[PDB]
Amino acid sequence: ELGTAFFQQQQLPAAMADTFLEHLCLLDIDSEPVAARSTSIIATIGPASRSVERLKEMIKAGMNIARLNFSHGSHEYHAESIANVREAVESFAGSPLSYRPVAIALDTKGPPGLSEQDVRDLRFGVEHGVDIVFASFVRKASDVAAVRAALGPEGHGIKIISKIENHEGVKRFDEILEVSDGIMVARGDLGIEIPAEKVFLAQKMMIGRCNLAGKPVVCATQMLESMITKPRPTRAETSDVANAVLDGADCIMLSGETAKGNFPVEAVKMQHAIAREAEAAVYHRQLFEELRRAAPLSRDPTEVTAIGAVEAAFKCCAAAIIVLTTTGRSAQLLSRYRPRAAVIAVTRSAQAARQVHLCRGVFPLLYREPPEAIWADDVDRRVQFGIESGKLRGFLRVGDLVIVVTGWRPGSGYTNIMRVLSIS
Amino acid sequence: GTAFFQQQQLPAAMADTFLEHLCLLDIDSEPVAARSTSIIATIGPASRSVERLKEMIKAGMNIARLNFSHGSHEYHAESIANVREAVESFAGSPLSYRPVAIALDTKGPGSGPGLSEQDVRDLRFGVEHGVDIVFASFVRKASDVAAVRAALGPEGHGIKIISKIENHEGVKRFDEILEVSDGIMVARGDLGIEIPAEKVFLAQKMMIGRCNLAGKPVVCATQMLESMITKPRPTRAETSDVANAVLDGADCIMLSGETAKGNFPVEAVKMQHAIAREAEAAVYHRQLFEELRRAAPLSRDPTEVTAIGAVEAAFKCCAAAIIVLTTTGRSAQLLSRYRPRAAVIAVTRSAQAARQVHLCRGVFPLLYREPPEAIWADDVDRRVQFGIESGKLRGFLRVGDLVIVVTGWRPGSGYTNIMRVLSIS
Amino acid sequence: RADVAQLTQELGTAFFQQQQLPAAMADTFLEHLCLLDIDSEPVAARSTSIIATIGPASRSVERLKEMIKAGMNIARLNFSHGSHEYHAESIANVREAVESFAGSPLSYRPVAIALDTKGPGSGPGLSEQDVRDLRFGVEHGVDIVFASFVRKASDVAAVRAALGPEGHGIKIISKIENHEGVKRFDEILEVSDGIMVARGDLGIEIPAEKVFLAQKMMIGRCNLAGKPVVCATQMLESMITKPRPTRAETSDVANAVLDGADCIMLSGETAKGNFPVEAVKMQHAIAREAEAAVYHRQLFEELRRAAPLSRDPTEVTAIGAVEAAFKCCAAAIIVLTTTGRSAQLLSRYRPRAAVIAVTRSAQAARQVHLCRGVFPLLYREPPEAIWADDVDRRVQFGIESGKLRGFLRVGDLVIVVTGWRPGSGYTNIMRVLSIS
Amino acid sequence: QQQQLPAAMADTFLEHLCLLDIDSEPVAARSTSIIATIGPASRSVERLKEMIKAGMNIARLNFSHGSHEYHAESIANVREAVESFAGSPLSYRPVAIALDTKGPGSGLSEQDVRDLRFGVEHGVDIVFASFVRKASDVAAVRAALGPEGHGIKIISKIENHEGVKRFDEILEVSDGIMVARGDLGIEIPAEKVFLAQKMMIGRCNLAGKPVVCATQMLESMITKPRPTRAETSDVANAVLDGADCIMLSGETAKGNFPVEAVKMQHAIAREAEAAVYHRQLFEELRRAAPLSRDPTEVTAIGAVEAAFKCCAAAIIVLTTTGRSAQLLSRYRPRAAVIAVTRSAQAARQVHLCRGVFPLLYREPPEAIWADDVDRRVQFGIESGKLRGFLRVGDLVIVVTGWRPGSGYTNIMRVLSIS
Ligand SMILES: O=C1c2ccccc2C(=O)c2c1cc(S(=O)(=O)N1CCNCC1)c(O)c2O
Ligand SMILES: O=C1c2ccccc2C(=O)c2c1cc(S(=O)(=O)N1CCNCC1)c(O)c2O
Ligand SMILES: O=P(O)(O)OC[C@H]1O[C@](O)(COP(=O)(O)O)[C@@H](O)[C@@H]1O
Ligand SMILES: O=P(O)(O)OC[C@H]1O[C@](O)(COP(=O)(O)O)[C@@H](O)[C@@H]1O
Ligand SMILES: O=P(O)(O)OC[C@H]1O[C@](O)(COP(=O)(O)O)[C@@H](O)[C@@H]1O
Ligand SMILES: O=P(O)(O)OC[C@H]1O[C@](O)(COP(=O)(O)O)[C@@H](O)[C@@H]1O
Ligand SMILES: O=C([O-])C(=O)[O-]
Ligand SMILES: O=C([O-])C(=O)[O-]
Ligand SMILES: O=C([O-])C(=O)[O-]
Ligand SMILES: O=C([O-])C(=O)[O-]
Ligand SMILES: [K+]
Ligand SMILES: [K+]
Ligand SMILES: [K+]
Ligand SMILES: [K+]
Ligand SMILES: [Mg+2]
Ligand SMILES: [Mg+2]
Ligand SMILES: [Mg+2]
Ligand SMILES: [Mg+2]
């Protein structure tokens, strides 16, 4: 069996509670997290965190997405920072245990329409192969259309995360979310544009709506602010990070903490440590029930397979859900149901591998073996690659159950199969 | 379409509370799904004719009960032969062939403390004549079930033992009896004389709830349509009793004198069919599925894990059916325990398993007769296609419907581990 | 376990094993069913009223006394049979049997008199025979009219008009007997005092296999509206000739109570059968078992969630009183009422505690039998000089009568519901009292 | 609608979050009490008047600093500032005085025995007992308060691993708990403090005992006029977690913006209280609160249920010790619990319970006890109207007892205002 020790870890006594109040009462500081940290960390790369050596430490500490703030620096300065990130990421390619994709995100300076500087910076993003754009001061759907148009003929695959920073963005949230790939709760400007005491309402509302829509949401700004000068955060800062994860944020961010502060690596380590504790404290019993009840009926096989796979994973306490994905969409649809099981996404797309860091609980594995002549063999090889990577990384052991999600034919858009495999 | 969402009590199904679900039940919302609660009809003088048996099979009889409290072995052997002749008369059309189980209902212990000598002889007769199920009378403890099992011998290991709970001791030792039985029958005739009549509904509801929780079949029996022994139409209490047995969670409903000796055996079957179909649509699946999942323990059995994933997937897309390949019936039983609204179409080569799965609510057995294809994946596909073609012919499926297909990774029982979303073409 | 541990130590484990209390404490409806226990004996007084049809087999004063003792709360007179003279004599016999127990509130049981109309026959509305029978009802002081074949709101307006100025206090229970009555249910319920699910005609007018849907829907809507609903016809049919009912019949009675019926009815079983008293005893025995098996935890939660917010102090006090009663496992809720309305508003929340309704109105005492769990106590003392003393005396009468009848025991907690000024409509006070 | 009522009507917690609206203005009075530490930056009578107007309900004196003479002068200044508003009885706001002990350091220390004696002699209402790690620590504090300090509330500060592990035994003998996050965040891993906070708040809510969230809630406001985004989030989340009180330490004791820090906690708490998902919270609290034969417990749940049914503007309760108001507060009604008491100490102490608004009764007594009760209820109504809690046409729930003295609450009445 699994043993009594298994059921005492990862807040499992609080997970089995019949009410949210009982769940809180059962949270235990001695119940150690076991699962891999699922909330991605976005770290802003600037003066304090640009060197290849420092970037290697940031990657080891847990950085998944490197943010470049185009309100500062120049194209040349940010191109060097991007090259340093890619050099630091590729320095781990000689070890499957440490190699991890890192997304590159361009955060625009901001705005009548798109500013001339934003057009040029978005063009720089396309030319430098950025994965994500954090679009500043998105106030309406037409702002997203303008950013999308500026990403032009080569950059349509770039994810647009709309930053909600003012009253209009909050009021027109639904129309903005509908055309965006995701949202950033940009609390710095939001806290100056609307009363500071109302920011938590906008944050909780936007995270809730993104969770309902199945689109990534980032919580940003001043999460560990005091760590710009101090080696340890305040009690409010650790609480803020934990509560952003409990609210439902897919990603958490560091700005000045990593861009210009004295402890960039420590700030990343702190977000990693808190997120892991907070993820185990999520009350999945209610969350899954509510996500299922609110999500409409669907005839899309990927969506149908995803909910079946997440339900199967909860039934057996599956160590992982291994999914084959070319665009990341099948992994994103699993992530929207918030499984406790890690979603190991095996993909040949380096871009999709970097971009799926936007979805909570997705662990991308970039697959580079040449395609097998028999498609069923190529699928089996990728599933075994996910399993062997999971064993090497500590997600899986022999005797564990894993859920495996695939499609009936090659190419994106055909996911329709869920299998239950015993790890051998 | 909007027409789809007005049928099968779908407005009541979408209600946020059980009270609002009741308020939204509509007599004009027609049932669409195939009737999922199996009908057990007792064989007797009113229903022994081969031609009458053909009408009973067409009316909806799924299990033929042989009551060994009446008649000799020669009588029951002729009943079995007539049942098999009527059932096999439809085998020439494999896409519409309906398996029918044969169940032997024992006389019981009488004044004795356990298995009677007549029950030993009757059980051996059952094994020799290939009966599918034993309804063991007056089961009072786990050792009664062990004695029935021992009396079936080495050749009767595959026969299902449904323990009849008929007295206070059987109700009190219910958990130990259920643990060793394949299922239970709430034998209300004797139960209503052994305990106060006004307490039988408590024992019925409790046993049905516990069987639903255990994922084991439960039968509601006796006097369900009693007045139809002599009258062409049942009383208001009888139609209510049948509907409430289905709403309670009974996998099967039974007819005794109504089919064994009455003047309306076919009409009694038709009446149970009509009521069960209306009552199944009136089940509040939102609460039932939530409570079955919450109560069902965590499992590391891949068949069980695939079954809950498949049922969840079926609810997500309003799947017309879950097509499952099964050797023993177990993969279909594990789907049935989650009470999907989608029909569980069970494709099997085992004639016995096809008959026995009628014990599980919502399982529609299809007996596949073709010998195995040389390539196993082709053999699996042909059986899934047989499930689809049978489903289209019977009205379960249409082009454009979504179905969930449940199969395993290798031949042989015990390896179900795959769930697939398929569009019917 | 922790939510009941202190009360389990105080009241004892025997208390918590009775009246399906282990099933009552279950967290899900499925667990509640699994915990139903045939050895868990009912303790509470039977709350679902029994309507018995009085006819040839049950007309004698001697037999009527046995029927009252067996549990009959409402006597039904079926104007499809007999005559005005025949029914007047049955009514006089019922009143003689009822008044034979009038020497004390411990023995007195008010029994309502209900007139069930012949109906419109082939006509579009109120027939001439119904006009005459309704006038007979008013002249003979009937408490309730079971109006046959109500198909729309104008049918109940016609019955109301035929009762005249003297019959304004008579309750109109609309019988839903056909497809149109089911389809126009909401408009009919709005203008009626309650509904009868008249399954005999309903089962011939619509497919027999659909009657249970109409029954469950109408009971649910009446429970939501807080108006009485009667389940009727063939509940114990075989008892017309047999001393024991079938398994389907006992199931039907239990399920009508579990569905939420305020009343259950006997027709031929008491009007013409060989076992009228035994049929009443059987409905009494089944209804007490089924009432204990109600899953109050979900029922109360759903009645709260569905019932709209209210600014009516009687309604606000009623929900507070029912909540208080559940918190302490109160033996009873004693309520002072002039029209029965304050007791009806307590009854709509389905407390497990008996609602002891103290009233000076003999008619309201008979009519409140339509509401589940209301036990009417007719108070006959003239008003005290000080109104607050008169209120206190009526509460003490409820307490003393309750103790002498086993509803209350010394040490029990009782919830008392009263108002701030005389007259109907001013209930606004809830008090928790310890019985000494 | 106002006070997040569209989010309040949601059928799931997820839909409730989706319906939260920054334009839905709070209307209800701020329920979560603010504890402000009184020190060098907030000692003056003039500053204390501004702190009281800003929303300070409890003045904390940190006995780790200053001296008996320094703290006695702070206490006198607090009382002078509080009493400067007593000329208006319908609007008078009581303010509790809480003594926070220095702690055991390396049983009960000799400095704590002297400071606790000082507390009793100066009539403090509450003791925040530092580093409580077991039930015997609470017994020692109680013994040190002596026979004259029987009425002082002991709020045990949970500051280390042992206090968290022995939480149940500590809560059982304490009047309430303080999640003292400063030391807790150094004694256990910083990333685990939120788990201890949420667990302790949940258990206190279940026990119906006050819980205080403390330390670094608005830390940056010691030097900056506006807090960080994490600080406003922390305050809001402490309220959403279920904290009865929120605290300011350095922000008011030594910072440059003590009044602004109080105003910020007030503004956030009011917004967060309206964002509480009462539908789930009430259902869970009501389900978990044990069955009881105590008439005050029975009346309290009946009154809270009645208040929710009619959207009551307030529950007016007469209380001698504060207990009847505390039992109403444990069910977290949206309706303000207006507690009318003659006890000045109970009026100050009842600030520990969320949503209890104490009114100190100083009107002449009525000869007949029933008449006296009616005028205390009319006092609650008149004070409620003046303060904006009540308007003509509102419904209120009134909770009283059957005889004088504490422990006899057993009546709930539905009253229409004016
Ligand atoms: O990237 C730079 C940078 C690059 C080149 C030269 C100087 C700077 C610089 O000075 C810098 C940068 C970024 C940020 S931030 O932390 O991203 N930012 C603070 C909150 N608002 C939005 C997010 C800075 O705080 C910052 O000062
Ligand atoms: O009241 C009488 C009666 C009075 C005078 C003389 C003979 C009879 C008589 O014979 C009688 C009566 C009543 C019922 S019933 O059961 O209430 N009822 C049958 C049809 N309508 C619906 C319900 C009878 O079944 C019945 O036969
Ligand atoms: O998530 P996406 O982008 O739709 O990709 C899922 C696809 O991956 C697969 O599992 C494997 O496809 P490939 O062999 O083309 O990589 C498909 O069967 C499925 O349609
Ligand atoms: O329900 P059971 O008895 O476990 O049978 C399920 C089995 O049926 C199959 O789908 C098909 O097996 P066969 O080809 O042997 O019939 C297996 O893969 C699976 O293990
Ligand atoms: O239930 P009803 O008909 O509203 O009667 C309740 C009324 O009874 C009382 O308790 C007593 O009134 P009376 O003294 O007129 O009988 C009133 O205070 C209250 O308004
Ligand atoms: O909340 P507490 O301390 O129990 O006080 C409630 C008490 O207050 C009262 O309402 C009024 O009592 P007093 O007149 O003594 O102030 C009592 O009837 C009740 O017992
Ligand atoms: O731009 C941002 O990230 C902000 O304003 O918080
Ligand atoms: O044996 C039976 O079927 C019975 O007694 O009901
Ligand atoms: O009239 C009735 O009572 C019926 O039809 O059931
Ligand atoms: O003592 C305290 O308040 C702390 O450490 O947080
Ligand atoms: K920017
Ligand atoms: K038999
Ligand atoms: K009639
Ligand atoms: K201190
Ligand atoms: Mg900004
Ligand atoms: Mg029997
Ligand atoms: Mg009729
Ligand atoms: Mg400390």
DSSP string, C68-109: HHHTEEEEEEETTSS-HHHHHHHHHHHHHHHHTTTT-TTT--
Angle between helices D193-207 and D278-288 (to 10 degrees): 60
CB contact under 8 A, A205 and D21: yes
Strands (E), C161-289: 171-176, 194-198, 229-232, 263-266
Taking the C-alpha atoms of residue C417 and residue C397, their distance in angstroms, rounded to an integer, is 14
Phi (first) and psi of residue A100, to 5 degrees: -145, 130
Residue D291: other Cβ atoms inside 10 A: 20
Minimum distance, in Å, between the CA of residue D3 and any CA atom of chain A: 12
Cβ atoms of A341 and A321 within 8 Å: the answer is yes
Q: Which helix or strand (DSSP H or E) is residue C67 part of?
A: helix C61-70
Taking the C-alpha atoms of residue B325 and residue B314, their distance in angstroms, rounded to an integer, is 16
The three-state secondary structure class of D132 is coil
- Cα–Cα distances (Å) from A147 to A117, A176, D328, in that order, read 12, 12, 54
The three-state secondary structure class of B368 is coil
Q: Which of D128, D133, D157 to mutate to test the pocket of ligand 10 (most atoms within 8 A of CB)?
A: D157
Taking the C-alpha atoms of residue B36 and residue B358, their distance in angstroms, rounded to an integer, is 9
Taking the C-alpha atoms of residue A101 and residue A88, their distance in angstroms, rounded to an integer, is 11
Give the residues across from D401 on adjacent strands.
D409
Taking the C-alpha atoms of residue B235 and residue C246, their distance in angstroms, rounded to an integer, is 11
Residue C41 tokens, joined: 């004996």
Cα angle: D389, vertex D391, D393; to 5 degrees: 135
Resolution of this model in Å is 1.7
Residue D143: other Cβ atoms inside 10 A: 12
The closest of B101, B260, B270 to B189, measured between CA atoms, is B260
Cβ atoms of A257 and A267 within 8 Å: the answer is yes
Contact partners, residue C124, CB within 8 Å, separation at least 6: none
Contact partners, residue B5, CB within 8 Å, separation at least 6: B11
Among the partner-chain residues D181, D267, D280, the one whose CB lies closest to the CB of A235 is: D181
Residue C356 tokens, joined: 């002891």
Taking the C-alpha atoms of residue C316 and residue C419, their distance in angstroms, rounded to an integer, is 12
Give the residues across from A133 on adjacent strands.
A106, A160
DSSP string, D170-201: HHHHSSEEEEEHHHHHHHS-GGGHHHHHHHHH
Cβ atoms of B152 and B134 within 8 Å: the answer is yes
Q: Which chains touch D (3 or more CB pairs under 8 A)?
A: A, C
Q: 3-state DSSP helix/strand/coil percent for chain C, to nearest 5?
A: 50, 15, 35
Q: Which chains touch C (3 or more CB pairs under 8 A)?
A: B, D
Q: Which domains does chain A have, with CATH numbers?
A: 40-279 (3.20.20.60), 284-418 (3.40.1380.20)
Buried b (16+ CB within 10 A) or exposed e, D70-91: ebeebbebbbebbeeeeeebee
- Cα–Cα distances (Å) from A14 to A20, A281, B335, in that order, read 9, 7, 29
- Measured by CA distance, the residue closest to atom 17 of ligand 3 is A407
DSSP code at position A186: E
Pocket of ligand 6 (CB under 6 A): D 318-321, 323-324, 400-401, 403-409
Q: CA quadruple C91, C97, C103, C107: dihedral positive or negative?
A: negative
Question: Does the beta carbon of C80 lie inside 6 Å of ligand 2?
Answer: yes
The three-state secondary structure class of A296 is coil
Q: Please identify which residue in the block is written with the tokens 């199904």.
A: B13
Cβ atoms of C36 and B202 within 8 Å: the answer is yes
Q: Which residues of D touch A10 (CB under 8 A)?
A: none
Strands (E), D27-85: 33-37, 56-62
- Measured by CA distance, the residue closest to atom 3 of ligand 9 is C198
The three-state secondary structure class of A387 is helix
Contact partners, residue C144, CB within 8 Å, separation at least 6: C74, C112, C113, C114, C115, C170, C171, C172, C173, C367, C370
Residue A153: other Cβ atoms inside 10 A: 6
Cβ atoms of A390 and A35 within 8 Å: the answer is no
Helices (H), C114-246: 128-139, 153-163, 179-183, 185-191, 199-205, 211-225
Taking the C-alpha atoms of residue C209 and residue D212, their distance in angstroms, rounded to an integer, is 61
CB contact under 8 A, B274 and C207: yes
Give the residues across from C432 on adjacent strands.
C415
DSSP code at position A115: -
Buried b (16+ CB within 10 A) or exposed e, C103-119: eebeebbbbbbbbbbbb
- Single-letter residue type at C338: T
Strands (E), D159-298: 176-180, 211-214, 245-248
DSSP code at position A245: H
The three-state secondary structure class of D290 is coil
Contact partners, residue D366, CB within 8 Å, separation at least 6: D372, D374, D375
Taking the C-alpha atoms of residue B297 and residue B337, their distance in angstroms, rounded to an integer, is 13
Q: Which of A305, A330, A382 to mutate to test the pocket of ligand 3 (most atoms within 8 A of CB)?
A: A330
Q: Which helix or strand (DSSP H or E) is residue A420 part of?
A: strand A415-422
Cβ atoms of C235 and C265 within 8 Å: the answer is yes
Q: CA quadruple D74, D75, D77, D78: dihedral positive or negative?
A: positive
Give the residues across from A251 on adjacent strands.
A40, A218
Strands (E), D27-124: 33-37, 56-62, 96-100
Cβ atoms of C189 and C221 within 8 Å: the answer is yes
Cβ atoms of C195 and C188 within 8 Å: the answer is yes
Cβ atoms of B146 and B134 within 8 Å: the answer is no
The closest of B319, B242, B318, B321 to B282, measured between CA atoms, is B242
Cβ atoms of B198 and C286 within 8 Å: the answer is yes
Taking the C-alpha atoms of residue C100 and residue C111, their distance in angstroms, rounded to an integer, is 12
Cβ atoms of C26 and C295 within 8 Å: the answer is yes
Q: Which helix or strand (DSSP H or E) is residue B43 part of?
A: none
The closest of B415, B381, B178 to B305, measured between CA atoms, is B415
Residue A21 tokens, joined: 């109040």
The closest of B208, B198, B306 to B253, measured between CA atoms, is B208
Instruction: Give the CA-trace dihedral at C224, C227, C233, C239, to 10 degrees.
Output: 100
| Burial bucket for residue C73 (CB in 10 Å: 0-12, 13-18, 19+) | buried
Q: Which residues surround ligand 16, an ion (CB under 5 A)?
A: B 166, 187, 189-190
N residues, chain D: 418
Cβ atoms of C115 and C134 within 8 Å: the answer is yes
Taking the C-alpha atoms of residue D208 and residue D211, their distance in angstroms, rounded to an integer, is 9
Residue B28: other Cβ atoms inside 10 A: 12
Q: Which helix or strand (DSSP H or E) is residue B287 part of?
A: helix B285-295
Cα angle: C91, vertex C94, C100; to 5 degrees: 140
Residue D362 tokens, joined: 């100083």
Return the ligand 3 atom nearest residue A378 CA: 14
Residue B50: other Cβ atoms inside 10 A: 14
Pairing of strands D56-62, D96-100: parallel
Residue C29: other Cβ atoms inside 10 A: 19
Q: Which residues of C touch D311 (CB under 8 A)?
A: 309
